[PDB]
């Protein structure tokens with residue numbers, strides 16, 4: 232095989248991870264999220280799926296902050312998207328962006344059976360051109376409450392420069408995979424696929440920059456593969 | 466302090482923990498939190514201290530849900546309490562409960578230097594009598610937004626029955642240490658102090674109970690020693 236992090240976890244044992252999933256995540260997972268997850272595990276890019284325990288953490292965060300208008304960048308088969316759509320109120324609206332709609336069509340039957348497709352506006356495109364177009368037309372009355380960032384890893388810093396202007400003051404920007412299977416912990420790290428090493432270097436730089444960015448407050452959370460919550464200050 | 470699990474981590478390496486703390490927590494840690502942490506690191510019961518990365522997570526939750534009135538059960542030297550106090554607005558209010566005010570007075574100078582002691586009503590007593598008294602005098606206008614539970618482990622379930630009546634609908638109840646150094650992951654775990662084993666068993670039952678409790682939605686988060694976020698439904 233070609234990728235060198237796919238079998239790693241940030242937790243010390245797989246048994247602890249399975250405990251969390253079986254005890255607290257799966258019993259609270261919507262039946263369509265379960266169906267979407269199980270077909271995605273068979274897909275060749277299963278490594279990139281947002282896990283069930285992180286998903287319930289995203290749902291909890293969305294409800295506690297009373298989010299209504301959100302943006303999802305990096306959809307894949309739609310697990311975190313369906314998680315968002317189920318957590319928002321019935322009049323919630325999501326802008327969902329991904330370069331590859333074929334992945335989205337794997338999840339769309341489960342989103343449709345859940346009855347939340349009406350909340351979703353899917354845009355098949357590279358993320359940055361869509362974001363830049365939003366900056367041209369965005370009214371302050373239409374800023375987003377919440378952004379989940381999970382698309383091209385090397386492009387997170389570029390995403391951030393747009394998203395600090397597209398989410399409201401007090402809104403949240405979440406960066407997925409910021410611990411990169413634990414490989415960010417070292418300046419040098421051996422044997423990775425070039426794409427994996429670029430992403431690793433990008434995340435070490437992002438984590439540093441985000442801790443120094445006065446436009447936001449942060450909390451890096453050791454759930455899933457690392458999630459960094461940012462809250463816009465001004 | 467002849468406990469066995471004290472130095473065990475749930476992350477796969479001390480280096481990964483140190484990276485998080487050094488890159489993302491310590492740069493964002495208030496000067497008075499640093500000083501309070503450093504004294505408590507030297508205290509006999511350092512094991513029970515809420516870590517700095519978890520503290521920023523608690524703070525982020527409080528700010529995202531716009532908490533105004535909270536309850537803190539289990540203060541110790543006051544790290545999570547100072548975190549809560551700095552997160553709330555100028556007119557925020559906290560009821561803090563601990564059996565041991567001696568601990569509280571270790572951190573009280575840092576709390577005062579932070580300019581936030583006016584938010585805190587410390588009560589030296591066992592939690593359950595206070596919560597029961599609060600129940601007999603509580604008005605629906607005065608329900609809490611947020612509750613952090615971090616006191617005697619074997620009594621969490623008892624606290625839960627009171628707190629689901631004392632926080633507002635949509636309010637948050639957070640249980641600390643719900644993975645208990647990871648030892649909750651197995652039916653049996655050898656080499657533990659008898660009080661450690663009682664806490665471990667108490668958490669396994671509590672984790673099962675909270676996942677089946679229809680009065681709340683939950684999310685268990687592999688941060689620190691595990692934190693379970695509950696949100697009151699009805």
Ligand SMILES: Nc1ncnc2c1ncn2[C@@H]1O[C@H](CSCC[C@H](N)C(=O)O)[C@@H](O)[C@H]1O
Nearest residue numbers: 280281305307310311329330357358382383
């Ligand atoms: N430049 C880009 N712009 C938009 N999407 C991109 C992109 N580069 C990669 N992607 C998409 O980003 C996704 C990352 S996997 C995302 C996982 C998803 N959030 C979940 O819940 O499981 C892939 O589907 C990929 O197609």
Ligand SMILES: Nc1ncnc2c1ncn2[C@@H]1O[C@H](CSCC[C@H](N)C(=O)O)[C@@H](O)[C@H]1O
Nearest residue numbers: 513514515539541544545564591592616617
């Ligand atoms: N029955 C009880 N009622 C109230 N507090 C109790 C209690 N039993 C133990 N405690 C207190 O619970 C605390 C647990 S340590 C708490 C750590 C603290 N939240 C932090 O930020 O680091 C101890 O201070 C202990 O004194």
Ligand SMILES: [Mg+2]
Nearest residue numbers: 279381407408
């Ligand atoms: Mg991801």
Ligand SMILES: [Mg+2]
Nearest residue numbers: 513615641642
């Ligand atoms: Mg604790």
